[PDB]
Design a protein around this ligand. Structure first.
Ligand code: ADP
Ligand code: ADP
Length: 196
């Protein structure tokens, strides 16, 4: 592994699209010393980087709601962790990763064993009304119903197997998404007070 769990403490923050991962992580970094890395943000930044050989590939995976190949994802991830660790940041909230078993096992074998997975358990009809409203507010390119159906599909098929894998290892803490932002945060806080 490039790191001992001493050096780098990683919590994976998982859940379907619109479950509130981005929202809870940005509140948490106000109260805790964790650095938040969003895998979809690292990807959208590479996609628009002048000189990227991956621009079209990332653009098309996001549009189609596909999992971008792990080699690309992992390298972006590894680099962002390395800059923080050099900048002397040892605790990370990795949001949106791993989304597929291969990413999951490569990360934990080559980089670092995670502390635990915070999983936002969320009903799909709730995720769907939050993404159509996010679509109106922010106008993110994949927050359109054709892409939303591909992202829900990929989530059930590819990403839920990973949840079930970490659950065998007793590393999953489920939090319900369907309460107000402030009531979901209280349970996020109780889960982290308990899990360190
Ligand atoms: N861990 C990952 N591995 C591969 N592709 C990813 C990963 N995370 C995000 N992506 C992608 O970029 C898109 C948007 O991700 P993200 O912004 O994290 O979305 P969401 O709001 O749906 O949680 C995903 O639908 C997929 O195409
Ligand atoms: N508990 C909540 N109740 C209502 N809207 C929420 C709640 N949590 C997050 N939202 C939002 O609904 C959308 C999805 O949340 P977001 O954090 O962006 O999710 P994710 O990162 O899982 O895709 C955003 O517009 C955000 O403002």
């Amino acid at each position: 592994p490039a790191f001992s769990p001493d050096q780098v403490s990683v919590i994976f923050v998982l859940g379907g699209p619109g479950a509130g991962k981005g929202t809870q992580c940005e509140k948490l970094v106000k109260d805790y010393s964790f650095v938040h890395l969003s895998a979809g943000d690292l990807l959208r930044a590479e996609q628009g980087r002048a000189g990227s050989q991956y621009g079209e590939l990332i653009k098309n995976c996001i549009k189609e709601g596909q999992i971008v190949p792990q080699e690309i994802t992992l390298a972006l991830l590894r680099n962002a962790i390395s800059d923080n660790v050099k900048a002397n940041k040892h605790k990370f909230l990795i949001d949106g990763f791993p989304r597929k078993m291969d990413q999951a096992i490569s990360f934990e074998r080559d980089i670092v064993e995670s502390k635990f997975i915070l999983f936002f358990d969320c009903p799909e009809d709730i995720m769907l009304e939050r993404l159509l409203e996010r679509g109106k507010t922010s106008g993110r390119s994949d927050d359109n119903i054709e892409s939303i159906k591909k992202r829900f599909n990929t989530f059930k098929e590819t990403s839920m197997p990973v949840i079930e894998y970490f659950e065998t290892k007793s590393k999953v803490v489920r939090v319900r998404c369907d309460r107000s932002v402030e009531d979901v945060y209280k349970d996020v806080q109780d889960a982290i007070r308990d899990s360190l």
